[PDB]
């Protein structure tokens, strides 16, 4: 009855992969592999790299590195629905950040198991606004690291800079994130509904929520219903990355979602149109960027973009359609391309 791809990961659950060193070396081959297993159906996958693999010898020299725009996260709301406001604070070093993160005021509360920590997160997220060293331009990777180097993954997203010279910070260049307890990332898909890779360099875990691409529209419909003012002002208000929605709120409205906790030394991959949100457990450092595969192309063509801010990420799809969909270029350009996306299909 059902198709081959529809049969793989039928519950759209977050999958975890443990590649051997051999399997790990070819990044784009490995992405294609995990999609052949239906990982993309979750919106989010975990990749644990081989034990004898490291992106950096040590993180002992990084104390003096600067965070030029740390933000204080003022969260407003109740009953599982919140809006996060970012207050930009003055530049600080990693050392100045770590001292504050581990200080009694801002540190992780004691707890037995994740569910307790998670309950404390949703209970206290509007109190004691934390500071996130978010969106810091840079890599922690060593120059010679050729495997899964966030600074040079060599996917087809490279065609953007290749074609145009255009660098989009955090999208085709890496970002670093210095977290503390209760720092959050709001519900969003990537810019242009791209993939992302996130590597947690060191520190306390980062917890993630995901909604399957298959159910993305369901999440948006809920969001639009809960924030009708924001939906009137913007065609894609979730891209403001201000909207927090607890897992209990999602259960209540029957939106499928899954959860994963990422540890130090683990990769998270998000897939096109996979909505994700989450929080940090304590002091930590993550590195991320966006990337693409041929399967992204149609998502990029159909991505609904923020209509109310001028600085938003906007990639010309022209070069991708021209190069990888030549049959459809003339049709697409005349606005007559009616391709429906199958979220289960790989490649």
């Amino acid at each position: 009855m059902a198709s081959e791809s529809e049969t793989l990961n039928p519950s759209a659950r977050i999958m975890t992969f443990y590649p051997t060193m051999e399997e790990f070396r070819n990044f784009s081959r490995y992405i294609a592999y995990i999609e052949s297993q239906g990982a993309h159906r979750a919106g989010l996958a975990k990749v644990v790299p081989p034990k004898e693999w490291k992106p950096r010898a040590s993180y002992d020299d990084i104390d003096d590195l600067v965070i030029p725009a740390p933000i204080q996260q003022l969260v407003t709301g109740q009953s599982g629905l919140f809006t996060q406001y970012n207050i930009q604070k003055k530049a600080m070093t990693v050392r100045e950040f770590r001292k504050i993160a581990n200080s009694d005021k801002y540190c992780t509360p004691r707890y037995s198991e994740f569910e307790e920590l998670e309950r404390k997160y949703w209970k206290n997220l509007t109190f004691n606004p934390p500071i996130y060293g978010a969106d810091v331009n840079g890599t922690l990777y060593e120059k010679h690291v050729d495997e899964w180097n966030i600074g040079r993954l060599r996917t087809i997203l490279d065609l953007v800079e290749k074609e145009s010279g255009i660098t989009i910070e955090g999208v085709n260049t890496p970002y670093l994130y210095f977290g503390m307890w209760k720092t959050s990332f709001a519900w969003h898909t990537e810019d242009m509904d791209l993939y992302s890779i996130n590597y947690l360099h060191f520190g306390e875990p980062k917890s993630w929520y995901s909604v399957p691409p298959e159910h993305g529209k369901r999440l948006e419909r809920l969001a639009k219903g809960f924030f009708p003012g924001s939906a009137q002002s913007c065609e894609a208000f979730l891209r403001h990355k201000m909207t927090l929605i607890s897992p209990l709120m999602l259960k209540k409205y029957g939106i499928p979602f899954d959860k994963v906790t990422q540890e130090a030394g683990e990769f998270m991959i998000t897939f096109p149109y996979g909505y994700h949100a989450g929080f940090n457990h304590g002091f930590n450092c993550a590195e991320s960027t966006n990337f693409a595969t041929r399967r992204w192309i149609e998502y990029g063509k159909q991505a609904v973009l923020c209509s109310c801010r001028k600085d938003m990420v906007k990639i010309s799809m022209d070069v991708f359609v021209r190069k990888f969909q030549p049959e459809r270029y003339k049709l697409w350009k005349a606005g007559k391309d009616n391709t429906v996306i199958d979220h289960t299909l790989p490649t």
Partner: peptide
Amino acid sequence: GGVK
């Protein structure tokens, strides 16, 4: 273009 833009910024993330």
